Amino acid sequence: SNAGRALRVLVDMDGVLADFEGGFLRKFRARFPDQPFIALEDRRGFWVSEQYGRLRPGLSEKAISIWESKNFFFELEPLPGAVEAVKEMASLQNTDVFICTSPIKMFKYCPYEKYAWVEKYFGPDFLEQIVLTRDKTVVSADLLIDDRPDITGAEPTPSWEHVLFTACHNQHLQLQPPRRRLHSWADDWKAILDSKRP
């Protein structure tokens, strides 16, 4: 809830609120049943298409066709606990929450579907909290909760502390102290927020 200055938290959409990896695998197997695939536990590296490309020639292009398809983003399921956690977080005194998400380059469906997904799970009033950007470094905040290990852009010294949200692709990564993780929404996100408050 708005403040003074409230603590400001940026929450990533794909891989944090919306299950991109699981949605991808389900749709990939359904469309391409005779192709090999990567079980979620075996995912390595941020870029799904790069791992698929090494598995068999042509699979990178087939992987791409999944996320470029209509309804891919809209039909993603929420991660367990994500809706409940972010609704609670937004309701806290002196706490402003933004959903900070990078859309894919193919813009026909993705931006629209991300607004529609937020309306669906968080309601109309949460639409005011959406920031779409390919550069999260130019968005100022106290915290950024995001599954991508390397978050870079035009601002060499972002104001936020990046808290790494665990995903299968990043789960084995050793981080440089004092970088830290949110292991899932069942993990103690309120302690992380409280650590940044005056």
Add this chain to the structure above:
Amino acid sequence: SNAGRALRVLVDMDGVLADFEGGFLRKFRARFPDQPFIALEDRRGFWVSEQYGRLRPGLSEKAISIWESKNFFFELEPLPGAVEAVKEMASLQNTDVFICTSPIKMFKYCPYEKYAWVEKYFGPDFLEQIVLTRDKTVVSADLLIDDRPDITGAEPTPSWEHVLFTACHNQHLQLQPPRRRLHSWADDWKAILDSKRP
């Protein structure tokens, strides 16, 4: 062009790059030919529907229906000089340009059409520069060029200097020193940028 830290400039879309006011009036007159309208020179106040609502009962709702319609955003014409200026600006050494735009609440068409409009006038590579947000105060930069007089949000002390881009609705407004204007894209935008450089 990217840097160190480049000077960072946020450029508004509606009323700065895209002619929202002219597009609105043209489509309003075409759809509602028997209703009274507001000539552009006579526009007062940021909110078009508020002025229309005072003109005749029911006109606020008719005005709204124009911007909620398919192709409203996509078919906006660029302001004179806007495309040329922003292409030149983005090409300058040590200068990063973002298009920082607030979409309307009705999300069916507007976000998509804004990406499509940028692709059309600036090309595919400029899509990486789009930031969609209802709160521009949480976007950090040196400058924000925007026709709205009152730009507020979660951050009480934005990093940018807001340069007021002239529109008929704001042209008579006296600003509190040291606030300043860009009167049109024919005006000396490079001098304003240079004033913020080290």
